[PDB]
Design a binder for this molecule. Sequence first.
Ligand SMILES: OC[C@H]1O[C@@H](O[C@@H]2[C@@H](O)[C@H](O)O[C@H](CO)[C@H]2O)[C@H](O)[C@@H](O)[C@@H]1O
Ligand SMILES: OC[C@H]1O[C@@H](O[C@@H]2[C@@H](O)[C@H](O)O[C@H](CO)[C@H]2O)[C@H](O)[C@@H](O)[C@@H]1O
Ligand SMILES: OC[C@H]1O[C@@H](O[C@@H]2[C@@H](O)[C@H](O)O[C@H](CO)[C@H]2O)[C@H](O)[C@@H](O)[C@@H]1O
Ligand SMILES: OC[C@H]1O[C@@H](O[C@@H]2[C@@H](O)[C@H](O)O[C@H](CO)[C@H]2O)[C@H](O)[C@@H](O)[C@@H]1O
Lengths: 141, 139
Amino acid sequence: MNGAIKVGAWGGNGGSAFDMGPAYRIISVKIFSGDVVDGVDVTFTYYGKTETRHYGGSGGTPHEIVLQEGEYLVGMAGEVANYHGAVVLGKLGFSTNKKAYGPFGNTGGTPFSLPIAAGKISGFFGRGGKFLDAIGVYLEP
Amino acid sequence: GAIKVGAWGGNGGSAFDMGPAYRIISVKIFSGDVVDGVDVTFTYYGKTETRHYGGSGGTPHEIVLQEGEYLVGMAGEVANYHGAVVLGKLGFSTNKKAYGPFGNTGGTPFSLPIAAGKISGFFGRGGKFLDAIGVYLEP
Ligand SMILES: OC[C@H]1O[C@@H](O[C@@H]2[C@@H](O)[C@H](O)O[C@H](CO)[C@H]2O)[C@H](O)[C@@H](O)[C@@H]1O
Ligand SMILES: OC[C@H]1O[C@@H](O[C@@H]2[C@@H](O)[C@H](O)O[C@H](CO)[C@H]2O)[C@H](O)[C@@H](O)[C@@H]1O
Ligand SMILES: OC[C@H]1O[C@@H](O[C@@H]2[C@@H](O)[C@H](O)O[C@H](CO)[C@H]2O)[C@H](O)[C@@H](O)[C@@H]1O
Ligand SMILES: OC[C@H]1O[C@@H](O[C@@H]2[C@@H](O)[C@H](O)O[C@H](CO)[C@H]2O)[C@H](O)[C@@H](O)[C@@H]1O
C-alpha cells in the first residue's frame, strides 16, 4: 500500500483472504493450534485505539506471545501441510529479539522460514477458513 | 532503516554484503550440483556496478530485468553438499515471470514470495559455492 512491505502468503489457496494491515504496535499474538494451526488472534494499537482481530478458524488451543516493551517479532516459521484435502499451516512459530516461540501444531509439511536480520513484523494477512490456510506478514525497520 | 530478510544457507564461507541498489539490472546464477555463485549488475547513485558471490564453477543462468520489472520472489533449498551447508537450488521471480530454481541438490526448502515490495540487494556467505543468501527489501 503506502510504502508497505508485504512479504509472504505461505500456505494453501483455500479459505478466504484476510488482511490485518500494518499495526502501530503489536501488543500480543495468540496462535490456536491443534493437529494444525486453527487461527491467529492479534491485539494491537492502531491510530490510538487498541484493536483485536480474529483470523483463521475458532478451534484449537491458545498459545500467546506477549510483546514486552522493546520486544518485537523478528522471525516467523512453520510448515504448510495437507490436512484432510486442504493445504493449511500444520505448524507455526515466531521469534522475538528476546525469546523464541513454538512452533505450535503437530502436522508436518513443506517448511518455510522468515528470519529477519533487520526489521520486524508489524502486521498480518493471509487466508482463513476452518483453519489457517495461509499467513503472511508486514515488514518494517 | 534497511529491511534485511533471511540469510538461508550455511555458516561456511565468508560474509558478503551487496547493500541495497537503486535498480538491479540483471542476475546470473552459476549452478552445477549446487549453487556455485551469483552475479549482480545494478545501478548505484549514477554508477553501474557488478558484484559476484561464491565460487567460480557452474553454468550461468541469467535473469535480465526488463523495463519496469523487479525481483518479487526468491526460493531454493539449502543443502549439505559433501560436508558444507550450501544452497543447492535457487531461483527468482519477477512480477512478470518465474526462473529456475537452478541446481540439482535438494535439502530443506525455503521461499520468499513478495506481495508488496521488491528485492534491491543481496547478502550472505560464500566460498567455493554460495553458502547462504539473503535480500534487501524495499517498497
Ligand atoms: O473444535 C472445537 C474444539 O477444538 C479443539 O481443538 C482441536 C484439536 O483437538 C484437534 O486435534 O485439532 C483441531 C484442528 O487442528 C482443533 O480444532 C480444542 O482443543 C477445543 O477446546 C475446542 O472446543
Ligand atoms: O479449497 C478450495 C475452497 O476452499 C474453501 O475454503 C475452505 C473452507 O471451506 C474450510 O472450512 O476451511 C478450509 C481451510 O481452513 C478452506 O480451504 C473456500 O471457501 C472456497 O471458496 C475454495 O474454493
Ligand atoms: O567450514 C568452516 C570454514 O568454512 C570456510 O569456507 C568454506 C570454504 O573454505 C570452501 O572452499 O567452500 C565452502 C563452501 O563454499 C565454505 O564454507 C570459511 O572460510 C572458514 O572461515 C570456516 O572456518
Ligand atoms: O569448476 C569449473 C567447471 O565447473 C563446472 O561446474 C561444476 C559442475 O560441473 C559440477 O557438477 O558441480 C559443481 C558444483 O556445482 C560445479 O562447479 C562448469 O559446468 C564448467 O563449465 C566449469 O569448467
